Paper text:
The crystal structures of SpLdcB and Bacillus anthracis LdcB (BaLdcB) were solved by single wavelength anomalous dispersion (SAD); BsLdcB was solved by molecular replacement. In SpLdcB, the liganding residues are His153, Asp160, and His207; the equivalents in BsLdcB/BaLdcB are His185/His160, Asp192/Asp167, and His244/His219. The active site of SpLdcB contains unattributed residual electron density that occupies the position of the fourth ligand in the tetrahedral coordination sphere of the zinc. The electron density in the S1′ subsite is of a size, shape, and location corresponding to that of alanine. The ligand is stabilized in this position by van der Waals’ contacts between the alanyl methyl group and the phenolic side chains of Tyr191 and Tyr201 and by hydrogen bonds to the side chains of Glu204 and the main chain amide nitrogen of Tyr144. We have modeled D-Ala because it is the enzymatic product of these enzymes. However, residual electron density adjacent to the zinc ion could not be modeled satisfactorily with any ligand arising from the enzymatic activity, the crystallization media, or purification media; consequently, the remaining electron density has been left unmodeled.
We report biochemical properties and crystal structures of the LD-carboxypeptidases LdcB from Streptococcus pneumoniae, Bacillus anthracis, and Bacillus subtilis. The enzymes are active against bacterial cell wall tetrapeptides and adopt a zinc-carboxypeptidase fold characteristic of the LAS superfamily. LD-carboxypeptidases subsequently hydrolyze the L-Lys[A2pm]—D-Ala bond to release the tripeptide. The LdcB enzymes are single domain proteins comprising two subdomains separated by a V-shaped cleft.
Numbering used by the authors: -4 to -1, 56 to 134, 137 to 237
Write the structure that this text describes.
């Protein structure tokens, strides 16, 4: 990511990547509370293949996943988690702030009902998410940069540039040189 500024497109901010334009949603850059594209079909088709490949490799992964969540959905979920604001902020997006609202983010689930955390499966996603155009967004040890505690299961579709990204070991923030961190 060498080196472009973030542009406001109106409903969202984006940064121009090496091959694609990359929507930026985090604690610094919110989405328009209206922006409601639903699930991205191109990302979805890749997720399907990713899922199948994990199942083929022996992993107990569900066909089900958590993808598009609108602003309103995010509101319920964030509120529910307050029940403190402090602790919920560590791991749950405020509405307008979630990559899930872009329709480009997807949480992988085990056939046991839980978000994937099992170690071999987590490593497989670090190793191969990029083969399907995805990155593990909330990397371990990058909580300062991304704004969020690490998530083994949360995939963000970025396309072809995922392999160079994964190779860097960087957060998107660091790779494209935009701000993440805490709400301001
Ligand atoms: Cl691809
Ligand atoms: Zn700023
Ligand atoms: Zn691979
Ligand atoms: Zn997620």
């Amino acid at each position: 990511g060498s080196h472009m500024e973030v542009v406001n497109k109106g409903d969202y901010y984006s940064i121009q990547g090496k091959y694609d334009e990359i929507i930026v949603a985090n604690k610094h850059y919110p989405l328009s509370k209206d922006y409601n594209p639903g699930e991205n079909p191109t990302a979805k088709a890749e997720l399907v293949k990713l899922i199948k490949a994990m199942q083929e490799a022996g992993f107990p992964i569900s066909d089900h996943y958590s993808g598009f969540r609108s602003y309103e959905t995010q509101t319920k979920l964030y509120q529910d988690y307050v029940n403190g604001k402090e602790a919920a902020d560590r791991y749950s997006a405020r509405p307008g702030y979630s990559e899930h609202q872009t329709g480009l983010a997807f949480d992988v689930i085990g056939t046991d009902g839980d978000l994937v955390t099992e170690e071999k499966a987590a490593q497989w996603l670090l190793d191969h998410a990029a083969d399907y155009g995805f990155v593990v967004r909330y990397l371990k040890g990058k909580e300062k940069e991304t704004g969020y505690m690490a998530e083994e299961w949360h995939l963000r579709y970025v396309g072809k540039e995922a392999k160079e990204i994964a190779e860097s070991g960087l957060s998107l923030e660091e790779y494209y040189g935009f701000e993440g961190g805490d709400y301001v």
